[PDB]
Amino acid sequence: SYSYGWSFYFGALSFIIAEMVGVLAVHMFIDRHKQLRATA
Amino acid sequence: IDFSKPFMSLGISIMIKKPQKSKPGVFSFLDPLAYEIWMCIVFAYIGVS
């Protein structure tokens, strides 16, 4: 019998935080290019 | 007295009630797939998306 601890959950939690930053960064990239497609 | 050689050998043993099947559980629909499978499915869903 086993039971995962907090260290394993930080690795799992890191993924979620990272994935959320990943989508956020993509959104920022698109937003920059949208500004350029409106001022040209 | 003088006992003879044992005609049978025994010992202290544990007696219980036979497992009469088992009462079900509320979240017992997740039994087929292990805990890890369910956890990794969530991670793969958040990733593919």
Swiss-Prot record, chain A:
Transmembrane segments: 10-30
Signal peptide feature range: none
Gene: Cacng2
Species in which this protein is naturally found: Rattus norvegicus
Function of the protein: Regulates the trafficking and gating properties of AMPA-selective glutamate receptors (AMPARs). Promotes their targeting to the cell membrane and synapses and modulates their gating properties by slowing their rates of activation, deactivation and desensitization. Does not show subunit-specific AMPA receptor regulation and regulates all AMPAR subunits. Thought to stabilize the calcium channel in an inactivated (closed) state.
Family the entry assigns: Belongs to the PMP-22/EMP/MP20 family. CACNG subfamily.
Subunit-level organization: The L-type calcium channel is composed of five subunits: alpha-1, alpha-2/delta, beta and gamma. Interacts with the PDZ domains of DLG4/PSD-95 and DLG1/SAP97. May interact with GOPC. Acts as an auxiliary subunit for AMPA-selective glutamate receptors (AMPARs). Found in a complex with GRIA1, GRIA2, GRIA3, GRIA4, CNIH2, CNIH3, CACNG3, CACNG4, CACNG5, CACNG7 and CACNG8. Interacts with GRIA1 and GRIA2. Interacts with MPP2.
Taxonomic lineage of the native organism: Eukaryota, Metazoa, Chordata, Craniata, Vertebrata
Location of this chain's protein in the cell: Membrane; Synapse, Synaptosome
Protein name listed in UniProt: Voltage-dependent calcium channel gamma-2 subunit
From Swiss-Prot, chain B:
Protein name: Glutamate receptor 4
Tissue-level expression: Detected in cerebellum.
Membrane-spanning residues: 35-49
Subcellular location: Cell membrane; Postsynaptic cell membrane; Cell projection, Dendrite
PTM note: Palmitoylated. Depalmitoylated upon L-glutamate stimulation.
Family: Belongs to the glutamate-gated ion channel (TC 1.A.10.1) family. GRIA4 subfamily.
Domain notes: The M4 transmembrane segment mediates tetramerization and is required for cell surface expression.
Native source organism of the sequence: Rattus norvegicus
Further comment: The postsynaptic actions of L-glutamate are mediated by a variety of receptors that are named according to their selective agonists. This receptor binds AMPA (quisqualate) > L-glutamate > kainate.
Function: Ionotropic glutamate receptor that functions as a ligand-gated cation channel, gated by L-glutamate and glutamatergic agonists such as alpha-amino-3-hydroxy-5-methyl-4-isoxazolepropionic acid (AMPA), quisqualic acid, and kainic acid. L-glutamate acts as an excitatory neurotransmitter at many synapses in the central nervous system and plays an important role in fast excitatory synaptic transmission.
Quaternary structure note: Homotetramer or heterotetramer of pore-forming glutamate receptor subunits. Tetramers may be formed by the dimerization of dimers. Interacts with EPB41L1 via its C-terminus. Isoform 3 interacts with PICK1. Found in a complex with GRIA1, GRIA2, GRIA3, CNIH2, CNIH3, CACNG2, CACNG3, CACNG4, CACNG5, CACNG7 and CACNG8. Interacts with CACNG5 and PRKCG. Found in a complex with GRIA1, GRIA2, GRIA3, DLG4, CACNG8 and CNIH2.
Lineage: Eukaryota, Metazoa, Chordata, Craniata, Vertebrata
Name of the gene this protein is made from: Gria4
